[PDB]
């Protein structure tokens, strides 16, 4: 089950758009979050190593279904690996930032 908060930047609330809608970049530089109208955090626990790029994904569908429901029509975004042997508190997370294109 995949965990998920919307952190408005700004009280104006935009007209909501669908998940389908949001263009999604990998998020590279500093300077990639300028502009943006909120941050998006997700997270789901992990027991696999085989299973990251699965669960950034399913991270990563929870963080698109937040920032559609905030208007925005844009993600970067950046999956956060544990280090070390995965044990019991072990999470694939999620950092992004969204926008309104």
Known sequence: E????????????????????VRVYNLQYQSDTQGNIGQVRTSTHVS?????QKLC???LKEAIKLAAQHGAHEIKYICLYPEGQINELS???????????
Not at 2 to 21: C, H, I, M, R, W
Not at 48 to 52: A, I, L, P, R, Y
Not at 91 to 101: E, I, K, P, T
């Open 57 to 59: 994904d399913k991270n």
């Open 48 to 52: 696999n190593e085989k299973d990251f």
């Open 91 to 101: 999470s694939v997370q999620l950092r992004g930032y969204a926008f309104r294109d």
């Open 2 to 21: 995949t965990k998920g908060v919307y952190l408005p930047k700004y009280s104006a609330e935009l007209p909501p758009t669908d998940p389908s809608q």
